[model samples]
Target: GDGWVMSENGARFWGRHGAAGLLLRAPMPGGAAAVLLQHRAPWSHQGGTWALPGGARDSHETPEQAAVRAAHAAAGLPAEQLTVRTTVVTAEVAGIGGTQWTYTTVIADAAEPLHTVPNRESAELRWVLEDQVADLPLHPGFAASWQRLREVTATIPLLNR
Candidate 1:
């Protein structure tokens, strides 16, 4: 593995190049929007918190590609089923030597409800209503970004809802 990248402030981030996550959203049966979330494994960092399906971004891959790959690897999400709406860099820190580490949240839309299969890194896979997301115990990173992501989601009309 390429492993972590340490920041100038002594903070460490997961990816060598950077990291990204998929904020996959879809309209539920009623009119509310739902987002796919991962329950992190208890043994992992920030374990036991709800978060997006994502991970380290390889040097050659774009943020969108990295997010899709992570979603597929962690939750069996098919890349073709999602349409990328936007990307938000929710976390960033200056690394050693003036380099930077960033975590991007790739906001995407699904045509309809989709199935999910959780990998070892995840305790469970769930689709949560947008309004109820903050009720769950969340990963620090995802929690910090939720408000902004919510605002972004509001701009995109739900096709089914």
Candidate 2:
């Protein structure tokens, strides 16, 4: 697991290099999006907020690998079920001692909503409709990306159909 990478300016980041998350969505009737969100455990950082399932990045893995693996452990989403579309750098902040740190979102889709089990890291796992994602209290990182990512969701129909 990655420790912490702190910026000289008092910002704290989760990973030694960068962090990654799984922005997994499923198609609702008529292709409306139902995206997976993790309700974080109260004990975790920024607890009780809704966010994508993700964790510290391992140097051996890509953002997709880290995202899917973390989602599997935290939300019980199976790797085989997801079709990855692309990855976006959702957040970035410069750090001290080396270079910049990043948080990447791995956009993916499943044919339909999938069942998820909450682990100790998760308070709950919900498949919320894309329009309603912003209604919930969100983690700072995800909140920033949700605006643009919402538009990205609309393009799925173009991507596969």
Candidate 3:
């Protein structure tokens, strides 16, 4: 029952209740690698931090489905417009000392410069250059994974979309 777990209240175990999402990244026209980041709304969990444009996964949706849905909902992005290059799923752990969430990054390539519009869940959206990302106040979780992401970027082929 990895995906089925009890909420904080310990009321009951709900099926299809766990949440997972994607961290989308794209390259700029000048060949600079950049990540598509979302500035979270001030009141949400880990709000006001720079991270990927993702959110809670619906009961019946897969990570990709939720990611694509969130992308469109928050930034008017059509997932089909980008070619997915890879998917990285971070495993989950249970219990008090464990993480209950999953972040499946969907790396993709875009045809043109991405223009994102901020939705209610986000205060801003932008394609931040990879090198400049270190200077920003990023979500703790995202920052922890940045090193690994940097290594991934070095070996993976950047799609010339």
Residue 137 C-alpha lDDT in model 2: 97
Q: Please rank every candidate by lDDT, starting with the best.
A: 1, 2, 3
- As for candidate 2, its clashing pairs are none
Using TM-score, rank the candidates from best to worst: 1, 2, 3
Decoy 1 TM-score against native = 0.94
Error of 2 at 47 (Å): 1.3
Candidate 2 residues 98-151, lDDT tens each?
677898899998888898888967889999988899999999878988999878
For residue 96, model 3's alpha carbon misses the true position, in angstroms, by 7.6
What TM-score would candidate 3 get against the native? 0.78
Candidate 1 lDDT: 0.88
Q: Give the least accurate 10-residue stretch of model 2, judged by summed lDDT.
A: 152-161
Question: Per-residue lDDT tens digits of candidate 1, residues 1-161?
Answer: 18877898897777787889999988887867899999989898788999998888987899999999999999888888888888999988999888789999999999877998888687998999999999999998889989998988888775543
The estimated TM-scores of all candidates read 0.94, 0.91, 0.78
Off by over 4 Å in 2: 158-161
